[PDB]
Structures are given as structure tokens and as C-alpha cells.
């Protein structure tokens, strides 16, 4: 999650706090996951080989 989030605390009652996103700065690219294209292709190749049996 490239964003630099800023957690903010809200006192909703005696002793109880609610943690809220007050501000968001930094890299605003959407959260993502990277899987190596070469490694995933050869892993599906192994899965397919064992799946044709």
C-alpha cells in the first residue's frame, strides 16, 4: 500500500478510542501485489503437467 497513511485517534467514550484515517499523502498508486511473470508461468506449467494426469 504505497500511501503514507496518517492514523487519527477519536475519543468516542470514557477510555475508548476510535482510530480513523485522518489524511493520506505520499505515493497514491493503488495497492497491488507483484508476482514474477517468469516464475508464475513455469509454476502453472508444473501444475498443468500434474493436472493432465
Amino acid at each position, epitope marked *: 500500500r504505497p500511501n503514507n497513511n496518517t492514523r487519527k485517534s477519536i475519543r468516542i467514550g470514557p477510555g475508548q478510542a476510535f482510530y480513523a484515517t485522518g*489524511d*493520506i*499523502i*505520499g*505515493d*497514491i*498508486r493503488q495497492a497491488h501485489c507483484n508476482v514474477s511473470k517468469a516464475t508464475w508461468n513455469e509454476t502453472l506449467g508444473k501444475v498443468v503437467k500434474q493436472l493432465r494426469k
Partner: antibody
Amino acid sequence: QARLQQWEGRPLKPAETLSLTCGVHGVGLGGSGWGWIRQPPGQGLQWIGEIDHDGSHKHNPALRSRLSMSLDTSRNQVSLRLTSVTAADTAIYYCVRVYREKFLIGEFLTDYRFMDMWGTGTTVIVS
Amino acid sequence: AIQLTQAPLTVSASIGDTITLTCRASQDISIWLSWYRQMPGKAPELLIYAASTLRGGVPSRFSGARSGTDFSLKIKNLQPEDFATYYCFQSDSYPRAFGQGTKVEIT
């Protein structure tokens, strides 16, 4: 009608505590950050220090361990407590509001602080 | 820290001219550089923030440019209220710094 008012503290003896106070009207201490800017006579401006929106105290490296600032949220006042004042500290002290606007570079979002609102001036002379 | 170099330290022009002020930074401070004008005896006021955005109320004559190292400010249609000392202030690194100050006067 939003203004920052600060009043003269009169000349002070050398090697003492420099107590400043800025009056914030029109707006309040919350959300922005509040700092201090000086100006020695016949010279340019100098950054002393600021408190940012987070409540975190940025201080100038030149003034080491003699800096201390506080915010009076109840009275809407910003305080400066420079200690061990030397003759070189004779300058007009300004109270400023470092306002945060977010500017979007190609992919990066930043909080940009740009001293929106300036005080009137407190001529501090030590002799 | 970052050192801002502002030259020329004294530029003179008559009413109704165009001047360009230069503020050179040490490192690359992106576009975070604001401009302040100090009328003699008064308090400094914000003209331009982020090196390009005009403050609310500043006339459209004032304008900045550049997002690298050689920041510039251009004044058009000079008026007596523009003959003051201008300062460039960076906001990239927390050891904040000001410019030396360009005193604009009449010839």
C-alpha cells in the same frame, strides 16, 4: 479579519529568557502549524522553529538546546522561550502559520508548508 | 542543509517595467519554494507558493516558474507597491532556509 497580533516585549538584559507570545484571531491553532521567523536589522530573514500539525517541534540547528515553543490552545497563543539571549539575537520576531496545501506531483502527494499568515513584528533589542 | 542563492541582490527599474528574480537552490528542492515580499518597515507577505501558484489577492502580474534548481519570479507592470525586498523560502528539507533578499528599487 484573520490576523496574528503580537505585542512588544521591551528591551531585555543579556543572558536572560526571551518570552514571546502571538495572538491568533480569525482562525485557531488547530490544523495548521505555527512557527517563528526573525529578521536581524539590515539582513534577511531567519527560520527559528515551527510546530507542525502533528504537534512535532522542528528547531533550527544553529540555536542548540536554547529553543522551546508551546501552543496555548485555550487562549489561542503561540509562545517562544529562547534562553541565554546574546547581542546577536537583536531582531524583529514574527509569528507565522505554516499552512499545508497538498500538491500532486506526477504520482506523489505532499503536504506543502508555506507560512500563509505573518505577524506584525516585535522589535527585540538586548543591551 | 539547503542554501538558497538569490541574485542579483539589487535590481533597479522604473514604473511599468518587467523584472525577473532568480533564486538558485543547492540541491533539487522539487517545486517547493515560496516567495515573500517585505515592504520596508512592514511584515513579509506571501506572493507565490509552490513556485507557481498565486496567493489569493496577488495580482496576475506576479508569476513564477521552474521546478528544478533555478527558480524565477517575474513581475509585470511595475507599481510603487512592488518596490520591496523579495525572499525565496524552500520547504523541502526540515532545516528550512531563506534567500538573501532582492531589494527592488526605482532607477
